Amino acid sequence: EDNCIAEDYGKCTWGGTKCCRGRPCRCSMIGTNCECTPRLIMEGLSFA
């Protein structure tokens, strides 16, 4: 099975796919249609 977001500025969702190596998401400028993030301090972080 391959279906992950291998990016740190990919297109993602809150509920949909997250980034591939257990990498967090925080959304775009409007609020919906999220993007990926490398590591977020306090909740998130790289490989979690």
Side-chain angles (χ1 to χ4, degrees):
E1 181 62 84
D2 290 277
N3 52 352
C4 65
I5 305 173
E7 291 182 82
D8 71 320
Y9 308 106
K11 312 298 179 289
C12 68
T13 313
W14 287 327
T17 326
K18 320 298 290 183
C19 275
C20 205
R21 189 57 181 263
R23 287 283 179 155
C25 254
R26 187 62 63 242
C27 275
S28 287
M29 281 70 183
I30 188 67
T32 54
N33 282 279
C34 279
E35 311 179 80
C36 263
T37 50
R39 56 189 72 196
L40 296 173
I41 190 165
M42 192 56 80
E43 292 80 75
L45 297 169
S46 57
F47 197 82

PDB file of all heavy atoms in Angstrom, residues 7-21:
ATOM      1  N   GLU A   7       5.817  15.181   1.669  1.00  0.00           N
ATOM      2  CA  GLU A   7       6.233  16.607   1.642  1.00  0.00           C
ATOM      3  C   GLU A   7       6.107  17.304   3.019  1.00  0.00           C
ATOM      4  O   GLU A   7       5.383  16.880   3.919  1.00  0.00           O
ATOM      5  CB  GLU A   7       5.360  17.295   0.559  1.00  0.00           C
ATOM      6  CG  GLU A   7       5.651  16.890  -0.906  1.00  0.00           C
ATOM      7  CD  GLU A   7       4.773  17.645  -1.907  1.00  0.00           C
ATOM      8  OE1 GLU A   7       5.265  18.895  -2.189  1.00  0.00           O
ATOM      9  OE2 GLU A   7       3.740  17.180  -2.388  1.00  0.00           O
ATOM     10  N   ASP A   8       6.863  18.413   3.127  1.00  0.00           N
ATOM     11  CA  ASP A   8       6.762  19.406   4.265  1.00  0.00           C
ATOM     12  C   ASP A   8       6.127  20.803   4.022  1.00  0.00           C
ATOM     13  O   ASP A   8       6.077  21.691   4.873  1.00  0.00           O
ATOM     14  CB  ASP A   8       8.203  19.604   4.747  1.00  0.00           C
ATOM     15  CG  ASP A   8       9.197  20.382   3.852  1.00  0.00           C
ATOM     16  OD1 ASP A   8       9.258  20.276   2.627  1.00  0.00           O
ATOM     17  OD2 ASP A   8      10.016  21.192   4.595  1.00  0.00           O
ATOM     18  N   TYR A   9       5.650  20.849   2.825  1.00  0.00           N
ATOM     19  CA  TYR A   9       4.755  21.877   2.230  1.00  0.00           C
ATOM     20  C   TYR A   9       3.839  21.211   1.127  1.00  0.00           C
ATOM     21  O   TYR A   9       3.447  21.873   0.161  1.00  0.00           O
ATOM     22  CB  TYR A   9       5.618  23.036   1.626  1.00  0.00           C
ATOM     23  CG  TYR A   9       6.686  23.696   2.535  1.00  0.00           C
ATOM     24  CD1 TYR A   9       8.047  23.417   2.344  1.00  0.00           C
ATOM     25  CD2 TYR A   9       6.295  24.439   3.655  1.00  0.00           C
ATOM     26  CE1 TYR A   9       8.999  23.926   3.224  1.00  0.00           C
ATOM     27  CE2 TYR A   9       7.248  24.932   4.543  1.00  0.00           C
ATOM     28  CZ  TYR A   9       8.600  24.683   4.322  1.00  0.00           C
ATOM     29  OH  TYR A   9       9.534  25.132   5.219  1.00  0.00           O
ATOM     30  N   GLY A  10       3.428  19.930   1.308  1.00  0.00           N
ATOM     31  CA  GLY A  10       2.399  19.256   0.473  1.00  0.00           C
ATOM     32  C   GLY A  10       0.985  19.790   0.674  1.00  0.00           C
ATOM     33  O   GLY A  10       0.746  20.636   1.531  1.00  0.00           O
ATOM     34  N   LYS A  11       0.046  19.280  -0.123  1.00  0.00           N
ATOM     35  CA  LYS A  11      -1.403  19.533   0.133  1.00  0.00           C
ATOM     36  C   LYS A  11      -1.911  18.322   0.965  1.00  0.00           C
ATOM     37  O   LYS A  11      -1.734  17.158   0.589  1.00  0.00           O
ATOM     38  CB  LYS A  11      -2.262  19.652  -1.146  1.00  0.00           C
ATOM     39  CG  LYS A  11      -1.751  20.563  -2.289  1.00  0.00           C
ATOM     40  CD  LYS A  11      -1.621  22.055  -1.905  1.00  0.00           C
ATOM     41  CE  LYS A  11      -1.079  22.967  -3.024  1.00  0.00           C
ATOM     42  NZ  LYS A  11       0.357  22.756  -3.298  1.00  0.00           N
ATOM     43  N   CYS A  12      -2.543  18.650   2.085  1.00  0.00           N
ATOM     44  CA  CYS A  12      -3.052  17.661   3.073  1.00  0.00           C
ATOM     45  C   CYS A  12      -4.436  18.097   3.622  1.00  0.00           C
ATOM     46  O   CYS A  12      -5.062  19.069   3.182  1.00  0.00           O
ATOM     47  CB  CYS A  12      -2.025  17.536   4.230  1.00  0.00           C
ATOM     48  SG  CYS A  12      -1.888  18.985   5.235  1.00  0.00           S
ATOM     49  N   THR A  13      -4.918  17.301   4.592  1.00  0.00           N
ATOM     50  CA  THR A  13      -6.220  17.543   5.270  1.00  0.00           C
ATOM     51  C   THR A  13      -6.071  17.222   6.793  1.00  0.00           C
ATOM     52  O   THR A  13      -5.160  16.541   7.281  1.00  0.00           O
ATOM     53  CB  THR A  13      -7.297  16.620   4.618  1.00  0.00           C
ATOM     54  OG1 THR A  13      -7.238  16.666   3.191  1.00  0.00           O
ATOM     55  CG2 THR A  13      -8.770  16.920   4.925  1.00  0.00           C
ATOM     56  N   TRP A  14      -7.055  17.760   7.506  1.00  0.00           N
ATOM     57  CA  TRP A  14      -7.335  17.442   8.936  1.00  0.00           C
ATOM     58  C   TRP A  14      -8.420  16.323   8.937  1.00  0.00           C
ATOM     59  O   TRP A  14      -9.619  16.617   8.859  1.00  0.00           O
ATOM     60  CB  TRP A  14      -7.807  18.713   9.703  1.00  0.00           C
ATOM     61  CG  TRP A  14      -6.754  19.792  10.028  1.00  0.00           C
ATOM     62  CD1 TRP A  14      -5.382  19.598  10.318  1.00  0.00           C
ATOM     63  CD2 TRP A  14      -6.969  21.152  10.200  1.00  0.00           C
ATOM     64  NE1 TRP A  14      -4.733  20.802  10.644  1.00  0.00           N
ATOM     65  CE2 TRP A  14      -5.739  21.751  10.577  1.00  0.00           C
ATOM     66  CE3 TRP A  14      -8.138  21.947  10.061  1.00  0.00           C
ATOM     67  CZ2 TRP A  14      -5.669  23.145  10.813  1.00  0.00           C
ATOM     68  CZ3 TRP A  14      -8.043  23.319  10.298  1.00  0.00           C
ATOM     69  CH2 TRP A  14      -6.828  23.908  10.669  1.00  0.00           C
ATOM     70  N   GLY A  15      -7.991  15.050   8.989  1.00  0.00           N
ATOM     71  CA  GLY A  15      -8.898  13.890   8.758  1.00  0.00           C
ATOM     72  C   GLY A  15      -8.504  13.021   7.535  1.00  0.00           C
ATOM     73  O   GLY A  15      -8.556  11.792   7.615  1.00  0.00           O
ATOM     74  N   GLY A  16      -8.108  13.668   6.421  1.00  0.00           N
ATOM     75  CA  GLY A  16      -7.492  13.005   5.248  1.00  0.00           C
ATOM     76  C   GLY A  16      -6.083  12.434   5.507  1.00  0.00           C
ATOM     77  O   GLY A  16      -5.716  12.056   6.626  1.00  0.00           O
ATOM     78  N   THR A  17      -5.294  12.390   4.426  1.00  0.00           N
ATOM     79  CA  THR A  17      -3.871  11.922   4.497  1.00  0.00           C
ATOM     80  C   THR A  17      -3.035  13.020   5.253  1.00  0.00           C
ATOM     81  O   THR A  17      -3.207  14.241   5.090  1.00  0.00           O
ATOM     82  CB  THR A  17      -3.221  11.676   3.074  1.00  0.00           C
ATOM     83  OG1 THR A  17      -4.193  11.197   2.147  1.00  0.00           O
ATOM     84  CG2 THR A  17      -2.104  10.608   3.122  1.00  0.00           C
ATOM     85  N   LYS A  18      -2.120  12.484   6.071  1.00  0.00           N
ATOM     86  CA  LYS A  18      -1.029  13.245   6.739  1.00  0.00           C
ATOM     87  C   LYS A  18       0.280  12.876   5.995  1.00  0.00           C
ATOM     88  O   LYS A  18       0.347  12.064   5.053  1.00  0.00           O
ATOM     89  CB  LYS A  18      -0.931  12.909   8.263  1.00  0.00           C
ATOM     90  CG  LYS A  18      -2.220  12.725   9.105  1.00  0.00           C
ATOM     91  CD  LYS A  18      -3.144  13.957   9.215  1.00  0.00           C
ATOM     92  CE  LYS A  18      -2.561  15.105  10.063  1.00  0.00           C
ATOM     93  NZ  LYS A  18      -3.521  16.213  10.195  1.00  0.00           N
ATOM     94  N   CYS A  19       1.364  13.520   6.434  1.00  0.00           N
ATOM     95  CA  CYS A  19       2.650  13.340   5.719  1.00  0.00           C
ATOM     96  C   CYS A  19       3.325  12.025   6.224  1.00  0.00           C
ATOM     97  O   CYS A  19       3.241  11.549   7.358  1.00  0.00           O
ATOM     98  CB  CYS A  19       3.501  14.617   5.830  1.00  0.00           C
ATOM     99  SG  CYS A  19       2.933  15.676   4.488  1.00  0.00           S
ATOM    100  N   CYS A  20       3.901  11.448   5.157  1.00  0.00           N
ATOM    101  CA  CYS A  20       4.382  10.062   5.010  1.00  0.00           C
ATOM    102  C   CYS A  20       5.222   9.479   6.187  1.00  0.00           C
ATOM    103  O   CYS A  20       4.921   8.370   6.635  1.00  0.00           O
ATOM    104  CB  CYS A  20       5.253  10.018   3.735  1.00  0.00           C
ATOM    105  SG  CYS A  20       5.258   8.332   3.093  1.00  0.00           S
ATOM    106  N   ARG A  21       6.258  10.200   6.655  1.00  0.00           N
ATOM    107  CA  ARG A  21       7.159   9.744   7.764  1.00  0.00           C
ATOM    108  C   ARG A  21       6.686  10.215   9.181  1.00  0.00           C
ATOM    109  O   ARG A  21       7.470  10.589  10.055  1.00  0.00           O
ATOM    110  CB  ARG A  21       8.575  10.273   7.367  1.00  0.00           C
ATOM    111  CG  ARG A  21       9.795   9.805   8.198  1.00  0.00           C
ATOM    112  CD  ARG A  21       9.993   8.277   8.263  1.00  0.00           C
ATOM    113  NE  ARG A  21      11.177   7.920   9.110  1.00  0.00           N
ATOM    114  CZ  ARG A  21      12.388   7.652   8.815  1.00  0.00           C
ATOM    115  NH1 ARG A  21      12.847   7.652   7.568  1.00  0.00           N
ATOM    116  NH2 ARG A  21      13.224   7.363   9.795  1.00  0.00           N
TER     117      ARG A  21
END
